Design a protein around this ligand. Sequence first.
Ligand code: FOL
Length: 202
Amino acid sequence: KSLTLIVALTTSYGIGRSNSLPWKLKKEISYFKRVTSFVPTFDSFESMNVVLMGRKTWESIPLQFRPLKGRINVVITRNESLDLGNGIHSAKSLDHALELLYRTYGSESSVQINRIFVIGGAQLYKAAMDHPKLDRIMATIIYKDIHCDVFFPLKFRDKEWSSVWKKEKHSDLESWVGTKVPHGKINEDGFDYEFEMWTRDL
Ligand SMILES: Nc1nc(=O)c2nc(CNc3ccc(C(=O)N[C@@H](CCC(=O)O)C(=O)O)cc3)cnc2[nH]1
């Protein structure tokens, strides 16, 4: 299957700032939660989405929300000297993770994978962007100048990338996520942001 990447970035492609949780957004995280958790419901088997994340992202999730509930969590660590729990998967790279997933949630598993999301960080976003299977980007554009030291690795919303990465209509975004979404800029605590969906032909 295809890989989807989900990210909240500023206009200048800034992903993270100097402190922890540089941008505080309860309605925006709720969107992250619903998109990453939305699955169809079948009577004979269980459907779950997978979230792929790097070790720093894993370590950033408050304890009461970790592992991400109702989703299959996979943490990418090379020097795996991480004490992960029971039910949490770990892989050395993204291709190794995909390998483990198709071997684990196969034909005989009662748990079947729905969608696969790459949730960061920037080293994992870099690897995904280079993956033949990445064809969609779920992006939340923050219309603010936050000091960031970490940027998104490809300026996919720029002119330079327009014949490769296309911004879908709002209605296709709503159809993919399975819910109507507010159009235009949303203000949340002095922050203006907008939801977008970009795809690439494979
Ligand atoms: N759109 C978007 N917004 C984000 O905040 C985001 N965050 C990450 C990485 N960081 C994080 C950090 C915390 C949680 C988190 O707490 N998730 C909970 C909901 C928390 C809540 O409701 O308060 C979850 O269950 O998804 C997720 C991702 C990656 N892509 C993103 N993409």
